[PDB]
From a paper:
Here, we show that the enterobacterium Shigella flexneri actively antagonizes LPS ubiquitylation through IpaH1.4, a secreted effector protein with ubiquitin E3 ligase activity. To understand how IpaH1.4 recognizes RNF213, we determined the cryogenic electron microscopy structure of the IpaH1.4–RNF213 complex. The specificity of the interaction is achieved through the leucine-rich repeat of IpaH1.4, which binds the RING domain of RNF213 by hijacking the conserved RING interface required for binding to ubiquitin-charged E2 enzymes. The cryo-EM maps show that the LRR domains of IpaH1.4/2.5 interact with the RING domain of RNF213, whereas the unstructured N termini and the catalytic NEL domains of IpaH1.4/2.5 remain unresolved. Binding is mediated by the canonical concave substrate-binding side of the LRR, involving an extensive interaction interface spanning from strand β2 to β7. Several hydrophobic interactions (for example, IpaH1.4/2.5 F120 with RNF213 F3992 and IpaH1.4/2.5 V177 with RNF213 L4036) and hydrogen-bonded amino acid pairs (for example, IpaH1.4/2.5 K100 with RNF213 D4013, IpaH1.4/2.5 R215 with RNF213 Q4029 and IpaH1.4/2.5 R157 with RNF213 C4035 carbonyl O) stabilize the interface. Substitutions of key interfacial residues, including L4036E in RNF213 and K100A, F120E, R215A, V217E and F238D in IpaH1.4 abolished or reduced binding between RNF213 and IpaH1.4. While WT IpaH1.4 effectively degraded RNF213, neither IpaH1.4-F238D nor IpaH1.4-R215A;V217E did so, similarly to catalytically inactive IpaH1.4-C368A. However, the respective RING domains bind the IpaH LRR in different orientations, with Zn2+ sites I and II of the RNF213 RING domain aligning with sites II and I of the LUBAC RING1 domain, respectively, when the structures of the two complexes are aligned by the IpaH1.4 LRR.
Residue numbers in the entry:
A (entry chain B): 37 to 273
B (entry chain A): 3784 to 3843, 3854 to 4099, 4112 to 4210, 4217 to 4233
C (entry chain A): 4684 to 4758
């Protein structure tokens, strides 16, 4: 089907409207297809639509394009950096997805997150609720969205970002945490467990209308140096 | 001269038909009476033709030539949109506004027959639409020209899209047209944002405003320098919005392209906001009848971001860092009779005071209301005649006789009593 | 010479008002306490329950005129 895949890409090419560096895309796609390169690129070519691209790729940059929708994603496309497309929603994430960036897209609801999603970045979408997270979610970036509630966090939530969201209360952050960012949410109160973390976790809660008594509580607890907890921040200026 | 003859002739026929008796003969005296009774209508028609003589070609028992002239004008403006040049069309619209709004005035057309009323019914939809479009030009287009000419073509296109969303029902005092204008202005702003930077424009993921002193990165997300200084504490220079792998040696700086882009989008947002404000003030809050419930509810829902306060705007991208309160919508609603708008004003007051933007010691907030209410009365009272002034003073005496007194809080009727008493 | 002085009236006038109101010649007068201070200190009949029964809600107010607009434009 490789012949049909590049053929369809040339066919979409004949649809080439102004601004679309489809020539460069077509060469990159064909070289990848014939050399069966594990990676493809489409960045900055102002594309508005994607045909089906080579299957055996495990990485891809399609950033800074103008797509509003994606075709089926290859089963092996582990690593997507699709920042700044115009996708209104995310099609099927393959089995082996290990990393995705979907910044500045127009998605409003995500498909299911596979088991191997060690990293996710979906910043600046228009989501209102998040699908379930896998146990190995070493990273979740969900900033920029409009989430009013947040599902549970898995075993290994090392990296987290939640800014610009509407989350009001946070599940328990286990010792897996090392880099938390939770600013400008609807945070009513957040647990003391954030203290139990290691001595190196960055934890910011700025911009939130948190309980003034909860902040005074966390100062009282940390200023009781008995804690070996992380470095906690509340606002800067 | 022929058309003025036809007008004064129809006026004379109408006036004589009410001669208390049959109108066997139409003598010369009635021509003066018709002129005296229909003076303003005829002078307005003359003014119209002076402004837009072409109307004559469009024209070619009752006085109707003024209304037909108005309809002709609104058509030779809806067809001649932005011709010869945006400034000449805007200026023609503006000049005609006074006579067209006179013709669309119920008092100006007292005694108008069914044909004149039927004409004016449509002339009002056309004029409201033309005025909405004229304000959109004046604020977004012309300003775009000097400040952000890269967008001048796109705003030109959206000018006509505005005319079309108002075409069918141009009474923006209703819900459909108001929501449609808002949808149009949001689509225009989004498209302008995509134009000024094909990576778009997004606010600083730290301060959630637009990135003053923009600092771009190998991931193209934008932040402020001062925000990156505060951010650079330790082990956490890697962007939050992205969790990028940082080569620790990285040290940022200002990328000019984005500061210019942001400046352009801020000028654009300021112009669109000024347009929405002017539409609300001039068109929506114009009639001698208050707008519907849904329009006012929507305005109040917009003033608050779900809370944080902002200037009167349809965009959820500008916010008063401190909870600022401003008098605009109160001044607009109070234009009408307090008895109709009191529940809107009390909903506004309670919605501010719902721990949303004010906490306690609200004596200054109430003074805002007290002054706005006082303005409404002063505004109305300065219109009164001397006999109406004496009648008003009598009514105030009767209110002072009738006035007699919960605690720990005020209400808009109580604040209105306080304003009136003051 | 004069303009520098008028520019700062928002600050300079409260100072003089205080110095006059606090003078022994005046501070023992109730009318002054009504004009400058809060009479609640010295009038017991004054209600204190409703926010509307404060001292500011019953304070003076800037009368809007053509001349005041003219001054503001000039500034
Ligand atoms: Zn910032
Ligand atoms: Zn990034």
């Amino acid at each position: 089907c490789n012949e049909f895949y590049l053929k369809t890409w040339s066919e979409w090419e004949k649809n080439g409207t102004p601004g679309e560096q489809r020539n460069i895309a077509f060469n990159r796609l064909k070289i990848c297809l014939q050399n069966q390169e594990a990676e493809l690129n489409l960045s900055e070519l102002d594309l508005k639509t994607l045909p089906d691209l080579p299957p055996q790729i495990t990485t891809l940059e399609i950033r800074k394009n103008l797509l509003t929708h994606l075709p089926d994603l290859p089963p092996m496309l582990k690593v997507i950096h699709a920042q700044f497309n115009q996708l209104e929603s995310l099609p099927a994430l393959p089995e082996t997805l290990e990393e995705l960036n979907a910044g500045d897209n127009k998605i409003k609801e995500l498909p299911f997150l596979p088991e191997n999603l060690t990293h996710l970045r979906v910043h600046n979408n228009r989501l209102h609720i998040l699908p379930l997270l896998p146990p190995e979610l070493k990273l979740l970036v969900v900033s920029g969205n409009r989430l009013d509630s947040i599902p549970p966090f898995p075993d290994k939530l090392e990296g987290l970002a939640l800014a610009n969201n509407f989350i009001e209360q946070l599940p328990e952050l286990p010792f897996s945490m090392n880099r938390a960012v939770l600013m400008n949410n609807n945070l009513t109160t957040l647990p003391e467990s954030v203290l139990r973390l290691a001595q190196n976790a960055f934890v910011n809660v700025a911009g939130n209308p948190l309980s003034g008594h909860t902040m005074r509580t966390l100062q009282q607890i940390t200023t009781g140096p008995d804690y070996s907890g992380p470095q906690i921040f509340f606002s800067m200026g | 001269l022929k058309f003025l003859q036809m007008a004064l002739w129809s006026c004379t026929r109408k006036l004589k038909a009410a001669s208390e008796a049959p109108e066997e003969e139409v003598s010369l005296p009635w021509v003066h009476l018709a002129y005296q009774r229909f003076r303003s209508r005829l002078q307005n028609f003359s003014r119209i033709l002076t402004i837009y003589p072409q109307v004559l070609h469009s024209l070619m028992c009752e006085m109707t030539l003024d209304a037909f002239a108005a309809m002709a004008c609104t058509e030779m403006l809806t067809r001649n949109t932005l011709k010869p040049s945006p400034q000449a069309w805007l200026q023609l619209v503006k000049n005609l506004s006074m006579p067209l709004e006179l013709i669309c005035s119920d008092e100006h057309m007292q005694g108008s027959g069914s044909l004149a009323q039927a004409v004016i019914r449509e002339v009002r939809a056309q004029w409201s639409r033309i005025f909405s479009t004229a304000l959109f030009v004046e604020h977004v287009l012309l300003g775009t020209e000097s400040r952000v000419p890269e967008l001048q073509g796109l705003v030109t296109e959206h000018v006509f899209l505005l005319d079309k969303c108002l075409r069918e029902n141009s009474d923006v005092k209703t819900h459909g047209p108001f929501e449609a204008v808002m949808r149009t202005l949001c689509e225009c702003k989004e498209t302008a944002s995509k134009t000024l930077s094909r990576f778009g424009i997004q606010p600083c993921s730290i301060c959630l405003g637009d990135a003053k002193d923009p600092v771009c990165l190998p991931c193209d997300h934008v932040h402020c320098l001062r925000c990156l200084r505060a951010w650079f504490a330790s082990e956490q220079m890697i962007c939050p919005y992205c969790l990028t792998a940082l080569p620790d040696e990285f040290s940022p700086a200002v990328s000019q392209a984005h500061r210019e882009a942001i400046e352009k989008h801020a000028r654009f947002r300021q112009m669109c906001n000024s347009f929405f404000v002017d539409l609300v003030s001039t068109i929506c809050f114009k009639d001698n009848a208050p707008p519907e419930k849904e329009v006012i509810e929507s305005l109040l829902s917009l003033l608050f971001v779900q809370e944080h306060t902002k200037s009167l705007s349809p965009f959820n991208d500008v916010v008063d860092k401190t909870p600022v309160i401003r008098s605009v919508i109160l001044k607009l609603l109070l234009k009408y009779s307090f008895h109709d708008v009191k529940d809107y004003i009390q909903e506004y007051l309670t919605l501010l005071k719902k721990k949303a933007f004010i906490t306690e010691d609200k004596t200054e907030l109430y003074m805002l209301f007290i002054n706005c209410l006082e303005d409404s009365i002063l505004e109305k009272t300065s219109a009164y005649s001397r006999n109406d002034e004496l009648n008003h003073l009598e009514e105030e005496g009767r209110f002072l006789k009738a006035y007699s007194p919960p605690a720990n809080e005020a209400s808009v009727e109580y604040l209105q009593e306080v304003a009136r008493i003051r | 010479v004069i303009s520098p002085e008028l520019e700062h009236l928002d600050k300079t006038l409260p100072t003089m008002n205080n110095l006059i109101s606090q003078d022994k010649r005046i501070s023992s007068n109730p009318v002054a306490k009504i004009i400058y201070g809060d009479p609640v200190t010295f009038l017991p009949h004054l209600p204190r329950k409703s926010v509307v029964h404060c001292s500011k809600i019953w304070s003076c107010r800037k009368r809007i005129t053509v001349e005041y607009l003219q001054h503001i434009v000039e500034q």
